[PDB]
Design a protein around this ligand. Structure first.
Ligand SMILES: O=[N+]([O-])c1ccc(O)c(O)c1
Ligand SMILES: [Ca+2]
Ligand SMILES: [Cl-]
Ligand SMILES: [Cl-]
Ligand SMILES: [Cl-]
Ligand SMILES: [Fe+2]
Ligand SMILES: [Fe+2]
Ligand SMILES: [Fe+2]
Ligand SMILES: [Fe+2]
Lengths: 355, 353, 358, 359
């Protein structure tokens, strides 16, 4: 278990950006800019800095050309410049490796702290960032599939309770989780900004990055991304969805970038900012928990996820989950799920829902 | 081949209603009224008569209590009263069994002809119907999942070219179909009213009714039906979708009523009313033909469909398809499909997507 | 206007309009760059445009000329022989006709243009060059995509006279607006089984009130508004967005660079049954035009496009003598109601929502 | 100028509910429940307690029968029980009248402080509230016009800068405002919860309550409210809209309840939770600032607003605005508005946009 520092936690505002290492910057540009319509804040031959429609900070996504596709940093913005000092002291007390650069690691970010966190993930904390033109009323640019905000990250980690306690001490509040009747936790969602999540934990071998999620305004915007992918004859890069989530109540879609980094498109979850916000726990065998309509979750959603880097840019070693596998217990050969608790009718034994 | 009668074909306007036999009227009522929000035009202890939001004829759906769930009649409205006489002469010349009721078979329909058609389906033709309040601006009644029009029927039949030619002789025009390079036809869609379909043929064992389809105004109305079914903890009755179709380009959902009658919810196909409307043929192995997003088609969608009745109310015997099976050639052990033709990447062999 | 002995042509639908525009590049910016229509052909003289779901060559031809005006409103007929029928029909009416075996505009074949009994330049054609139907080209689809041509709307001084003539041509009236003392202010009529393929608005005419395109959904119309705000051309949004009473469609009216009015429209209802119930609204009903009761801007009633004769000269305008919809509803002696018979929610001598005429 | 207290400001989470006095409880219930679809948490012969689709606290709106329709309280939830004490101390230091009820003023609220604030408005601060069933996935109940959240209040007050500074000291951050080139502020918007607004100030005679705002998921939900009001033949109760706002970038509608309390329906503003969120200032003469599409702002929007009560339940006296009037300077006789700054084309002199004048 991860101890609670004496040192005060930094005041974290929200998830702010991810830096993803990609192998072919032009193929990645085509996906994120031409297919998905993200806005270029800055680009050169090594990196593309992208932002969503409503963002005013420099970027929400940094694509960095490199030899091995992986997450290099998941960044959270903190409330004040002095919260970057707080973050540094906090992670030092945790005995984590840290690195601080007063002029930032990427363009458009100033004084920033990167850490290898207790779960093996590269977190950044920053306040200072270069403001850019907020494009929120640039309806002359607005795409039928427009991505309007960065919403969250999702992390694969082998021991969810261990990770949950650490994130709670950091000030994240759990909104929803998935457990069973035998004391296992399979997933948890937690926030700072008053939505269902800024980050989330999915039980599995880790550290790996499960996905980065962007918001749309409306459900038809997500439908348009699917339709466009069909027209481009790249429907094979649609992994799962579109659907309605149980957990989060959001309308969603999962797609795969050219290096198989998973992107979620997400809309219309609910407000969580009250400190006694009711926590919702789903049973792992409830077939409406992930897709509310009961559509089956493809095995790749559970098994595939991106590598993460340490502060030297090397791939973090993967530690195997020993807790029960959500895949195995719901859709594996001895799996089970139900539509109605206690009802044999609409239940699934050793197979996924819908045939 | 079904010969073309010398007698003139009835001028068919559109699909108008289906009469479905149901086993438990109250359970059916709960599904079609409380879950789906159809509007009651009449009911008693034996039948419920229902219509969509924008309809002015008496009904689009009749639920009739009976011992065996089945399609009892798929009804088309014809342009004039004389077209019912034309229908009678046409089907008589085809050698089909017919029954004429000058005062109708169901309430709110007048002079009507029912036939056991050459594919074994119970068709009704009528002009006369009781007009009711058109609810198209009754936004005080409008549901988040509102069903606004009856759009089409879909019939399972073993020989699609045989059925197609018969429907063409009746004035239906084919808009889209699915074929392979070997020359097999797997499915065809055909219309009178200037949308992609009023009826459609799915290759399979028949006669069986594949589904009845209703439209919504917008895609979010279809999403809401799914969301409602999740809240009612009946998500197991969502069979397939929601999706974008390849064929028709419509946004769609398939759901199952208490007797396993399949209902499609549909929106935003295209105009087909010009007589040289371009006909679109998809290859059966194209994994974007049925769901444009490449989502797999569950086997039950190909194998399960409703019984149909003859004019005595007995179940029509089924004839097995001898042409190749769409299920088998796409998702069965020897099947395949592609995302991009000639590309093994994004292709599926012996396996769905 | 007498019913000919000659049979009417079988009209399928409205198909395209040819608009004369004064600055081709400025018009192109509006129809292509702002509105997203798709180019079938263009040169220094003309731009040929189609909607997202169209397979015929075009829905709109922009023709450079000295005086902005409607040059032709074109209806597609069912067969080649229907063009001959249209020629015989209009000749029996005593109208000036001109037949070109190879068309008046590119991508149309054998075509008949007529100066009709109301002064309007109608075209009838069957033959047209098919193009790529873009209906699944979601790689092109804009947030404001115009998906079909829906209808025309004509300003004419005597609505019943026009209505009777269109009925003889096979159009069926769906909705109209009347008062209690026998004046008709507007009528809507169709061939293709929607509310309208053309429509008559009482006023000085012949003038073209608007051409209408459809979207898939209501949000697509909202986006057009939003885009016009971002482009700082909100002054070219004339009226809306709204819900119509008549037609029940969601709508918007915008103005092109020559003040030609374009309606964007969605989700009217099916009218293809021959006994489709007609709907008559009282002119004083403040929900008849905008169902939400929003006021109808006076320019909507007063302004419309010139139309040309077959020589390309402007048709002389004839004044309406029947009562004016503007005057009887929102003028200083006008009135409208929310609930018939109820003084609460009624407006006298001004428009709804607290405005009077500017 | 309202001084900054030495005492620490309470930590405010969000706007939480309004209590409105209504004259005919059954008529008001018809509007809020039968027309708008809000969910009943409790009712009796005297009050109706209502909540939105996604709410878990007891209510977002209390309708209280009384002789004079008015705003009785605009309630903000605070982060901890101790923040109610901080609120009491803060407002006492400001010299404001306060009333503390350990078991609440209304049902489903616990320990609560009501205050006559320095602008004359009845504010409530509370933490304790009865949780109820959160209906966020009850799609069996979901209306085509569903109101999903309470979003904000908007207050009419004569001196906007004075109010703005007081709210900033209380920890609200201004997201957008409307000013001119002569030093006048006409309106300001300010938040705690990380949306454009939890409350907002509109220049005019006050204190009066301009509106309470609820959100929908999507724009079509707002369209449906309008459609339904047409079907119910109460389109006269649609005051303004629907539209796209300039300020907030939200899609919006204003409607009027049976006592002429104004309700806004709103959707799809943007995130403001970063502390250096860029403040957007619109010029008062920009004809896209209130309605982005340039539609004219109905004069009642500027002139009409609800009475507010003091802690005794008496109506607060109105103080006249002496700063320039937004109505007068934009759509009045000597008014002016533009579409494009510096362009005469698309400008309006002494009248409203789109061909209208003041009635
Ligand atoms: O592409 N298909 O699966 C189709 C297309 C249209 C239909 O109405 C349908 O039921 C199936
Ligand atoms: Ca000035
Ligand atoms: Cl999920
Ligand atoms: Cl109108
Ligand atoms: Cl405003
Ligand atoms: Fe996620
Ligand atoms: Fe179908
Ligand atoms: Fe129109
Ligand atoms: Fe507001």
């Amino acid at each position: 278990e991860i101890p609670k520092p004496v040192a005060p936690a930094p005041d974290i505002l929200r998830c702010a950006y991810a830096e993803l290492v990609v192998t072919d910057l032009a193929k990645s540009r085509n996906f994120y800019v031409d297919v998905l319509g993200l806005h270029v804040s800055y680009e050169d031959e090594n990196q593309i800095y992208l932002r969503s429609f409503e963002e005013f900070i420099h970027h929400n996504l940094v694509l960095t050309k490199g030899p091995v596709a992986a997450l290099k940093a998941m960044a959270f913005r903190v409330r004040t410049p002095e919260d970057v000092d707080k973050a540094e002291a906090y992670y030092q007390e945790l005995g984590c490796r840290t690195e601080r650069r007063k002029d930032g690691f990427v363009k458009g970010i100033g004084d920033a702290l990167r850490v290898e966190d207790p779960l093996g993930f590269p977190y950044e904390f920053f306040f200072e960032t270069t403001h850019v033109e907020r494009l929120h009323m640039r309806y002359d640019l607005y795409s039928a599939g427009e991505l309007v905000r960065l919403d969250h990250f999702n992390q694969v980690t082998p021991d969810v309770p261990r990770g949950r306690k650490y994130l709670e001490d950091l000030g994240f509040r759990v909104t929803e989780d998935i457990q069973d009747d035998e004391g296992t936790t399979y997933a948890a969602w937690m926030h700072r900004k008053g939505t269902v999540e800024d980050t989330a934990l999915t039980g599995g071998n880790g550290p790996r990055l499960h996905h980065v999620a962007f918001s749309t305004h409306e459900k038809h915007n997500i439908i348009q991304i699917c339709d466009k992918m069909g027209a481009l004859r790249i429907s094979d890069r649609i992994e799962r969805g579109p659907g309605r989530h149980g957990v989060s109540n959001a309308f969603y879609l999962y797609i795969l970038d050219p290096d198989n980094h998973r992107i979620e498109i997400y809309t219309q979850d609910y407000y969580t900012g009250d400190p006694d916000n009711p926590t919702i726990t789903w049973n792992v065998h409830d077939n409406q928990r992930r897709d509310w309509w009961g559509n089956p979750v493809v095995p790749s959603w559970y098994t595939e996820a991106s590598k993460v880097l340490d502060l030297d840019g090397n791939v973090q070693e993967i530690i195997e989950r020993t807790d029960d596998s959500e895949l195995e217990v719901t859709i594996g050969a001895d799996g089970f799920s139900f539509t109605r608790a206690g009802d044999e009718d609409g239940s699934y034994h050793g197979q996924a829902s819908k045939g």
